[PDB]
């Protein structure tokens, strides 16, 4: 279509703000009961229990909770299929599971199991009565409404905000507290960033690496599927710590990169890399570190790959929109 | 320096260190029998309270395989520190007592010699799988597993990862003190032989035209698919991605189209909804897809114990991959974006 404001996908990524803003006034008070029993009686590690987007999100849990309280975040594994020869110790473990509708059974026998053994179960879900927040121990609403797009917005990124809240309250900053509460207002100047070099540059593209690190890997997960799911393209979530693989074999003149870089100049490799790719003809685009591609300035650090996110979003509706495809669709069922 | 032909698969470094794969391990088990009964049984004597792993490249998919193995063997969970999962700034982690595992064919990375150090700072338990003895990752190490696997001159890393896996697998079972185990250690190295002569050439044939493949894999397996899409990338310019089968619904999905090339690899006991079930959605949108194990049509090695199979597969790929490469104009040995004939 020629109005990139008329899919679903644009109108709910455009409510990400208020979403996060009621959901942390929601939240606050059992978000900090939560943070304080955690500090009466820490976990020896924290487990994430998520697919899909919401791993992605588990991806930035882990970078928040390893970097900011110092605990080692592993990553549980819901629909594989293990045999355990041994029962999973994971008694006093922070067991958070990310599920937007929390009715997926792989997801509710993982967090059975995980009470079982002694963790405890929170549920960061949407949803707020399904089956696995009726079984968790403390159950975080998302808060995000209802996504009629089939592409996942909001949703992401109320959930990348939950956790934010409780990496914030947990740990007992100060500083990330105070910027929880400018977060809303950055959230809409993200969403007012003029991406159109990197919509206009993957009209025509076929192969794209989204390339990101730490803080912003799993913003660069999230980019890479929404890219599959509503454009038909394969672009691949690669870090930037393994650049020399992947990216350095396969950039090329019609392989483009897109990177999502932090401030210290990580997230795209080093200077030599990027200089590589472009005597290479790559085009490549940068968010961050004073990249090409402009960014809405962060209230505190932490915040920065929600920003990005609520950017991209607009960027991949309307890129969607000019490679042919309706991104509220499904895949397969959306060529216009 | 090294001369292939391209007509000549035996021709290549990458196939020639491939083939040892079976000799390492026999010797990399020998030599480190006694080394890993006193590890196992301190780790006995004193229970860490979960495992960390922390490794690059191919080395990572082999901690991927440890995180399968050591959570259903041993009951641990295992998570990454590894630089493609973790921070730029190695920092403490609360690691007391934890099991730090470093994978490292050189040993010599400077940023897994900072998490190693970090860790060991944090009162980790640090032990270095590494193939350079003297590297120093393994000088920092409070216990040193030498991989045993020589020289590895392709630019194709094909016996130390192998020999990786294998090291993980004779760990797990000196620890756990499984019998059934470790009698199927013993039959390992001939049936790593036997996988090396599993013919591929259908998926060979297949793909020289292909630009864009999906490898799956799950749980033991998904290690090996990650390290299965890494070598199509760089020893064949093909952009492969690995994706866990459980997440099929989430990207590969969406872009499959007729025709599409998908290279499934499936465990031999899988209960419940698992390879196949995904690879029907794949058959009825029309793409090639091909399955390694579960009675698919690429022929594995038997393998002695369920938790062989994944090496199984990767050694038959290797030789699979290889092929591929030379008949698309690569040579493997070379480094990647600069190895075309």
């Known amino acids: 279509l020629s109005d990139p404001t ?3 996908m644009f109108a709910e990524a455009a409510e990400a703000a208020d979403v996060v803003a009621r959901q942390f006034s929601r939240n606050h008070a059992t978000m900090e009961t939560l943070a ?3 500090r009466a009686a820490p976990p020896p590690f924290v487990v994430t229990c998520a697919r ?3 791993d992605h999100a588990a991806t930035y849990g882990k970078y928040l909770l390893e970097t900011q309280l110092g605990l080692v975040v592993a990553s549980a594994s819901p629909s594989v299929g293990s045999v355990y020869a041994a029962p999973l110790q994971l008694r006093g473990a922070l067991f958070i599971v990310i599920s937007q509708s929390g009715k997926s059974p792989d997801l509710l026998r993982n967090a059975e199991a995980a009470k079982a053994a002694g963790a405890r179960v929170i549920a960061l879900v949407n949803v707020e009565d399904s089956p696995l927040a009726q079984l968790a121990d403390t ?3 998302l808060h995000a409404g209802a996504e009629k797009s089939v592409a996942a917005t909001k949703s992401y990124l109320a959930s990348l905000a939950a956790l934010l809240q409780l990496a914030a ?5 100060s500083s990330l507290r105070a910027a929880l509460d400018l ?6 100047e993200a969403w007012q960033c003029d991406w159109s070099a990197v919509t206009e540059g993957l009209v025509e593209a076929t192969n794209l690496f989204v390339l990101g690190r730490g803080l912003g890997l799993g913003a660069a997960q999230e980019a890479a599927l929404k890219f599959k799911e509503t ?3 394969h672009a691949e979530a690669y870090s930037s710590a393994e650049v020399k693989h992947g990216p350095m074999a396969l950039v090329d003149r019609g392989f483009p990169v897109l990177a999502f870089a932090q401030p210290d100049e990580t997230g795209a490799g080093t200077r030599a890399v990027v200089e590589e790719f472009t005597a290479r003809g790559a085009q490549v685009w940068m ?3 004073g990249g090409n591609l402009p960014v809405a300035a962060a209230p505190h650090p932490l915040c920065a790959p929600l920003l990005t996110v609520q950017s991209f979003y607009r960027a991949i509706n309307a890129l969607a929109l000019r490679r042919g495809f309706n991104p509220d669709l499904p895949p397969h069922l959306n060529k216009v």
């Open 169 to 173: 309250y947990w740990k007992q900053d």
């Open 6 to 8: 008329s899919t679903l």
């Open 52 to 54: 899909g987007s919401s």
């Open 139 to 141: 159950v975080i609403p």
């Open 183 to 188: 977060l809303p207002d950055a959230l809409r």
């Open 287 to 289: 968010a961050g570190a």
């Open 231 to 233: 454009c038909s393209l």
């Open 36 to 38: 304080a029993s955690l």
